[PDB]
Structures are given as C-alpha cells and as structure tokens.
Short mmCIF file of C-alpha atoms in Angstrom, two decimals:
data_model
loop_
_atom_site.label_atom_id
_atom_site.label_comp_id
_atom_site.label_asym_id
_atom_site.label_seq_id
_atom_site.Cartn_x
_atom_site.Cartn_y
_atom_site.Cartn_z
CA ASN A 1 -30.10 16.87 47.18
CA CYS A 2 -30.77 15.83 43.51
CA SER A 3 -28.67 12.38 42.65
CA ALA A 4 -28.95 9.83 39.78
CA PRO A 5 -31.26 7.10 39.15
CA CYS A 6 -28.38 4.96 39.55
CA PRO A 7 -24.44 4.66 40.19
CA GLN A 8 -21.27 4.75 38.33
CA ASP A 9 -21.22 1.36 35.89
CA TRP A 10 -25.10 0.22 36.78
CA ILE A 11 -27.81 0.06 33.70
CA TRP A 12 -30.85 1.84 34.23
CA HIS A 13 -33.88 -0.02 32.95
CA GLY A 14 -37.29 1.62 34.27
CA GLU A 15 -37.28 1.96 37.50
CA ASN A 16 -34.78 -0.48 38.91
CA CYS A 17 -30.13 -0.05 38.11
CA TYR A 18 -28.55 -3.91 37.64
CA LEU A 19 -25.20 -4.70 37.07
CA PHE A 20 -23.48 -7.82 35.52
CA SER A 21 -21.03 -9.11 37.50
CA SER A 22 -17.29 -8.87 36.60
CA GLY A 23 -16.48 -12.87 37.19
CA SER A 24 -18.20 -16.37 37.60
CA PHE A 25 -19.16 -16.83 41.71
CA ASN A 26 -21.02 -19.49 43.59
CA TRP A 27 -24.53 -18.43 44.81
CA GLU A 28 -24.00 -17.33 48.08
CA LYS A 29 -20.53 -15.46 46.69
CA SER A 30 -22.65 -13.81 44.34
CA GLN A 31 -25.56 -13.14 46.75
CA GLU A 32 -23.14 -11.51 49.23
CA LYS A 33 -21.57 -9.71 46.69
CA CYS A 34 -24.79 -8.20 45.56
CA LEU A 35 -25.89 -7.30 49.20
CA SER A 36 -22.45 -5.68 49.69
CA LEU A 37 -24.16 -3.06 47.42
CA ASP A 38 -27.37 -2.38 49.47
CA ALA A 39 -28.32 -4.12 46.37
CA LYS A 40 -30.07 -8.16 45.78
CA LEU A 41 -29.58 -10.97 42.92
CA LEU A 42 -32.35 -10.14 39.88
CA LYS A 43 -35.56 -10.81 40.10
CA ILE A 44 -38.14 -11.37 37.27
CA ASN A 45 -41.88 -10.26 38.45
CA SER A 46 -43.04 -9.90 34.52
CA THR A 47 -41.61 -10.77 30.66
CA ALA A 48 -40.82 -7.29 30.54
CA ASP A 49 -38.33 -7.78 32.77
CA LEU A 50 -36.60 -10.70 31.20
CA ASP A 51 -37.05 -9.44 28.00
CA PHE A 52 -34.59 -6.65 29.09
CA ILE A 53 -32.51 -8.40 30.84
CA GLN A 54 -31.96 -10.68 27.89
CA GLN A 55 -31.26 -7.72 25.57
CA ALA A 56 -29.05 -6.47 28.18
CA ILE A 57 -26.97 -9.77 27.99
CA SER A 58 -26.37 -9.29 24.28
CA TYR A 59 -26.29 -12.81 23.19
CA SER A 60 -23.47 -14.15 25.78
CA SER A 61 -24.01 -17.89 25.79
CA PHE A 62 -22.48 -17.62 29.64
CA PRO A 63 -24.95 -18.56 32.52
CA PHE A 64 -26.44 -15.75 35.20
CA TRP A 65 -26.95 -16.65 38.27
CA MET A 66 -30.62 -15.27 39.08
CA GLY A 67 -31.98 -14.98 42.98
CA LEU A 68 -34.31 -17.58 42.61
CA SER A 69 -33.65 -20.80 44.94
CA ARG A 70 -34.64 -23.84 46.62
CA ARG A 71 -33.32 -25.92 49.25
CA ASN A 72 -34.56 -29.50 47.92
CA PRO A 73 -37.76 -30.58 45.12
CA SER A 74 -40.10 -30.37 48.33
CA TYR A 75 -40.22 -26.19 48.28
CA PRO A 76 -41.20 -24.08 46.27
CA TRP A 77 -38.33 -21.78 43.98
CA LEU A 78 -38.63 -18.18 46.14
CA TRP A 79 -37.18 -15.61 45.53
CA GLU A 80 -34.69 -14.08 48.05
CA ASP A 81 -37.26 -11.69 49.21
CA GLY A 82 -39.90 -15.07 50.09
CA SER A 83 -42.00 -14.46 47.56
CA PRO A 84 -42.78 -17.25 44.74
CA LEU A 85 -42.22 -17.43 41.49
CA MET A 86 -45.15 -16.21 39.02
CA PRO A 87 -46.74 -18.25 37.04
CA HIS A 88 -46.15 -18.27 32.77
CA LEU A 89 -42.52 -16.20 32.95
CA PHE A 90 -40.51 -18.81 32.31
CA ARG A 91 -39.51 -22.81 32.45
CA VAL A 92 -37.07 -24.13 35.02
CA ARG A 93 -34.87 -26.76 33.23
CA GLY A 94 -32.44 -28.73 34.55
CA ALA A 95 -31.36 -30.14 37.35
CA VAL A 96 -35.05 -30.68 38.86
CA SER A 97 -35.44 -33.28 40.78
CA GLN A 98 -31.50 -33.75 42.48
CA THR A 99 -30.53 -32.35 45.85
CA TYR A 100 -27.65 -30.66 46.36
CA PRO A 101 -25.84 -29.70 49.85
CA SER A 102 -25.75 -25.76 49.65
CA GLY A 103 -29.50 -25.93 47.92
CA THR A 104 -30.52 -25.45 43.47
CA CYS A 105 -30.23 -22.02 42.02
CA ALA A 106 -31.92 -20.44 38.70
CA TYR A 107 -29.21 -19.39 36.14
CA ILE A 108 -30.19 -17.49 33.15
CA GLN A 109 -28.15 -18.91 29.81
CA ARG A 110 -28.91 -18.46 26.41
CA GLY A 111 -32.54 -17.26 26.83
CA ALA A 112 -33.84 -19.94 29.24
CA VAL A 113 -34.10 -20.60 32.69
CA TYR A 114 -32.08 -24.05 34.43
CA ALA A 115 -31.74 -25.46 38.38
CA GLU A 116 -28.49 -26.14 39.28
CA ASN A 117 -26.28 -27.14 42.80
CA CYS A 118 -25.33 -23.53 43.88
CA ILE A 119 -21.81 -24.48 44.67
CA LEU A 120 -21.57 -24.15 40.69
CA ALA A 121 -19.88 -20.58 39.46
CA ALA A 122 -21.52 -18.15 37.07
CA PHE A 123 -22.25 -14.78 36.44
CA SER A 124 -24.72 -13.10 38.11
CA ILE A 125 -26.86 -9.58 37.95
CA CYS A 126 -27.57 -7.02 40.71
CA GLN A 127 -30.39 -5.12 40.69
CA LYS A 128 -31.84 -2.19 43.20
CA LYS A 129 -34.49 0.23 43.07
CA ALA A 130 -33.77 2.96 41.10
CA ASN A 131 -33.40 6.97 42.81
CA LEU A 132 -36.74 8.29 40.97
CA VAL B 1 -37.14 24.58 31.45
CA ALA B 2 -34.20 24.67 34.48
CA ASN B 3 -34.41 21.13 36.08
CA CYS B 4 -32.51 18.20 37.43
CA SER B 5 -31.37 15.35 34.74
CA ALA B 6 -30.24 11.93 34.40
CA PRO B 7 -25.97 12.31 33.87
CA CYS B 8 -27.08 8.96 30.92
CA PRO B 9 -30.05 7.92 29.10
CA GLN B 10 -31.55 4.60 29.99
CA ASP B 11 -29.63 1.00 28.30
CA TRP B 12 -26.40 3.57 28.57
CA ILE B 13 -23.49 3.28 31.33
CA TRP B 14 -23.47 6.09 33.49
CA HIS B 15 -19.02 5.77 34.12
CA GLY B 16 -17.02 9.16 35.10
CA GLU B 17 -17.69 11.92 32.72
CA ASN B 18 -19.26 10.19 30.11
CA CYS B 19 -22.16 7.50 29.04
CA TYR B 20 -21.50 3.98 27.34
CA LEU B 21 -23.96 1.92 24.87
CA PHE B 22 -23.08 -1.14 24.63
CA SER B 23 -25.13 -1.89 21.05
CA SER B 24 -25.47 -5.25 20.28
CA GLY B 25 -26.09 -4.35 16.95
CA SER B 26 -23.74 -6.55 14.66
CA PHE B 27 -22.78 -4.47 11.54
CA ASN B 28 -19.20 -3.46 10.38
CA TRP B 29 -16.60 -0.66 11.37
CA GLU B 30 -18.48 2.06 9.56
CA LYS B 31 -21.84 1.49 9.55
CA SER B 32 -21.18 0.86 13.52
CA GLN B 33 -19.50 4.02 13.68
CA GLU B 34 -22.08 5.80 11.95
CA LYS B 35 -25.08 3.92 14.43
CA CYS B 36 -22.91 5.91 17.07
CA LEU B 37 -23.46 9.21 16.00
CA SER B 38 -26.68 9.19 15.33
CA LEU B 39 -27.23 8.81 18.90
CA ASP B 40 -24.91 12.23 19.16
CA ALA B 41 -22.10 9.56 20.54
CA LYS B 42 -18.89 8.75 19.10
CA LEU B 43 -17.01 5.14 18.58
CA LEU B 44 -14.55 4.04 22.14
CA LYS B 45 -12.25 5.86 22.69
CA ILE B 46 -9.44 4.96 25.64
CA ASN B 47 -7.42 7.56 27.08
CA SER B 48 -5.87 6.00 30.49
CA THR B 49 -5.88 2.59 31.82
CA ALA B 50 -9.05 3.52 34.41
CA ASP B 51 -11.46 3.78 31.12
CA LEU B 52 -9.49 0.29 29.91
CA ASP B 53 -10.11 -1.63 32.85
CA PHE B 54 -14.15 0.17 32.95
CA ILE B 55 -14.20 -0.98 29.44
CA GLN B 56 -12.95 -4.70 30.36
CA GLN B 57 -15.01 -4.92 33.82
CA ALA B 58 -17.85 -4.02 31.48
CA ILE B 59 -17.65 -6.76 29.09
CA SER B 60 -16.16 -9.39 30.81
CA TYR B 61 -19.69 -11.44 30.80
CA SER B 62 -19.01 -10.85 26.82
CA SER B 63 -18.59 -13.55 24.39
CA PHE B 64 -18.34 -11.60 21.25
CA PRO B 65 -15.92 -8.44 19.85
CA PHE B 66 -17.11 -5.13 20.24
CA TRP B 67 -15.23 -2.10 18.13
CA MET B 68 -14.04 1.03 19.42
CA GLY B 69 -12.55 3.52 17.69
CA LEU B 70 -9.08 3.37 16.62
CA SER B 71 -8.18 2.06 13.37
CA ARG B 72 -4.99 2.69 10.76
CA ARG B 73 -5.01 2.55 6.72
CA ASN B 74 -2.45 -0.52 6.46
CA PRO B 75 0.49 -1.75 8.92
CA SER B 76 2.92 1.22 7.86
CA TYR B 77 0.81 3.51 9.73
CA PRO B 78 0.39 4.01 13.65
CA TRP B 79 -3.06 3.25 14.89
CA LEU B 80 -5.29 6.74 15.54
CA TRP B 81 -8.90 7.37 17.25
CA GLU B 82 -11.66 9.00 15.16
CA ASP B 83 -10.46 12.68 16.16
CA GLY B 84 -7.24 11.98 14.59
CA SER B 85 -5.39 12.02 18.25
CA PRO B 86 -2.62 8.97 18.34
CA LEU B 87 -2.61 5.68 20.76
CA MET B 88 -1.42 6.84 23.84
CA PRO B 89 1.33 5.07 24.69
CA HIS B 90 1.35 2.39 27.97
CA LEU B 91 -1.86 1.65 27.62
CA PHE B 92 -2.38 -1.70 25.66
CA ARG B 93 -1.26 -3.59 22.35
CA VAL B 94 -3.12 -3.97 19.59
CA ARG B 95 -2.58 -8.28 19.07
CA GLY B 96 -3.87 -10.45 16.08
CA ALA B 97 -4.18 -9.45 12.18
CA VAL B 98 -1.32 -6.33 12.15
CA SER B 99 0.31 -7.59 9.32
CA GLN B 100 -1.88 -7.61 6.16
CA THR B 101 -3.65 -5.22 4.63
CA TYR B 102 -7.50 -4.71 3.73
CA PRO B 103 -9.49 -2.74 1.03
CA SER B 104 -11.14 -0.62 3.75
CA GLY B 105 -8.14 -0.26 6.70
CA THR B 106 -7.27 -2.47 10.03
CA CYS B 107 -9.92 -1.59 12.87
CA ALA B 108 -9.45 -2.31 16.26
CA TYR B 109 -11.80 -4.23 18.49
CA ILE B 110 -11.87 -5.57 22.49
CA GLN B 111 -12.30 -9.32 23.45
CA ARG B 112 -11.27 -11.53 25.84
CA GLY B 113 -10.19 -8.68 28.15
CA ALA B 114 -7.48 -7.61 25.21
CA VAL B 115 -7.70 -5.36 22.00
CA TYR B 116 -7.61 -7.52 18.75
CA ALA B 117 -6.45 -5.57 14.93
CA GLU B 118 -9.53 -6.82 12.16
CA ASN B 119 -10.88 -6.37 8.68
CA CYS B 120 -12.80 -2.58 9.09
CA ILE B 121 -15.83 -4.36 6.61
CA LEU B 122 -16.39 -7.10 8.56
CA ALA B 123 -19.22 -7.13 10.85
CA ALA B 124 -19.33 -6.98 15.29
CA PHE B 125 -20.83 -5.02 18.60
CA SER B 126 -19.80 -2.04 19.53
CA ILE B 127 -18.67 0.72 22.50
CA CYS B 128 -20.79 3.99 21.90
CA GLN B 129 -19.67 6.58 23.97
CA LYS B 130 -20.82 10.42 24.49
CA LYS B 131 -20.28 13.27 27.75
CA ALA B 132 -22.11 12.47 30.56
CA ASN B 133 -24.91 15.71 31.66
CA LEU B 134 -23.27 17.15 35.11
#
C-alpha cells in the first residue's frame, strides 16, 4: 500500500528522513536510540548533506553527534557502516590526539566538526532512507 | 491525475493532521505571519497538550525563540490566535513581558520549553503550519 516518505516528526530531505534528538546523551546512547527507530546516526556523504544539516540546525549553537568515530588516533575515522570519511567534506577539529576509554566521536557545532570523548553528552541527528 | 502524494512537502515536519515548518528567517511577527501565508500556511496554533509536547520536543535543540500565532493589543485584552479563537485553558501560561504596552501589540514566542510575551516588532524565527495531504 502507499506510504509516506518519512514517519511523523521526521524531516524529509531528498532520499532521506532526519530526526533531531530531544535531549543530550553520550554517543553510545545516541547510537542506540537511532537503531531502535530502524535508523543510524547522521552520515555525511557530500557537501549538499552538510549544507542541509546546517540549514536545519537553524543557527543553533548546541553540539550534534554524527555517526563518525574511532577507537584512538591510530585508527581512521569511520562511519557506523565501516566506510571512511571521504576527503574535502569537512575538517575534524578539537581533541584529535587523545585516547579516551570509550573512543573519540565527531560532533557538529556552529557549522564546524569536532572530535571529542564519546562518553560526553550532546544532541544527535538520526537518519534513514525515505520511502520513495 | 489520481495518484499518491506525500503528506507534507520536503523540509517540513509531518505531525498528526498537519505539516510544520521551522523557518530560520529572522523577522517581526507581521512579516513572519506574511511568510506563512505565502506558503498556504498560518503561524503555529496550539489546540492541545499533545501539540505543545510535539512543538517543545521538535524545538528543544534550538537556542532561539519562535513566534507563534498568539497575540493581544495590551495587558487588558485576553490572548487570541490569528483565527480569533481564545487561548484554551490548561495548555500553557504566558511568561515574560506581560505588563507592558507596545505600539504594535504583544505577541507570543516559544523558547526554553515555555511561552513568553514580547513586542511584536522584534525579530525572531517562527513556526508555520498547514493541513497535511491525507
């Protein structure tokens, strides 16, 4: 039967559905919440994804976890699906030389992307494919 | 024609019978009202606690205030939506600038998980709403 591209409360953009979290949680809790909704943490494949996300953030100063992480600085930045961060999308600033017990994760804040201890709390964005 | 359509346009949020647009245009209450009208929509109108719960949840990541369609000329008048209907009781209290009189009236905005009163000529984001294609 015919269905809506995205569920209620989500934002439909292009081929995907986006959900902004209602609160700040650590990266692992944020990951768990996207999985319970048959979604994953935000994955940026192009500058157009980053531009839509920043437009949707609507000038918020808060940090938002995305699905990019690494165990320590010897490992490359990977998305939850194991694929690497494609070059020329964004620079990862901040805590890029330290090793934290629960890993280092990326968040977006005021347009720029920062690396931080995964146990710290931030808002997050979930995404899943739209029904098209 | 006779084909299936999406309940809401892209960049809007579908909730219940309506579509919501959280516009990041920073304009006064009258210009924000005008922009909603140009999109076949009106400024946000909250009819139930479920509407307020959805709105507060949809804007808790935002640090900025959002105009809604509630207003009054001055403190002697009750709060009224764009359609002339009153603020139904047991929904929310309006905090902030509730004793002053501004030349272009007083308008309400939502922020901090709460509704505040402010001078209508001031600039803020706004929430538009229209009926979903159901």
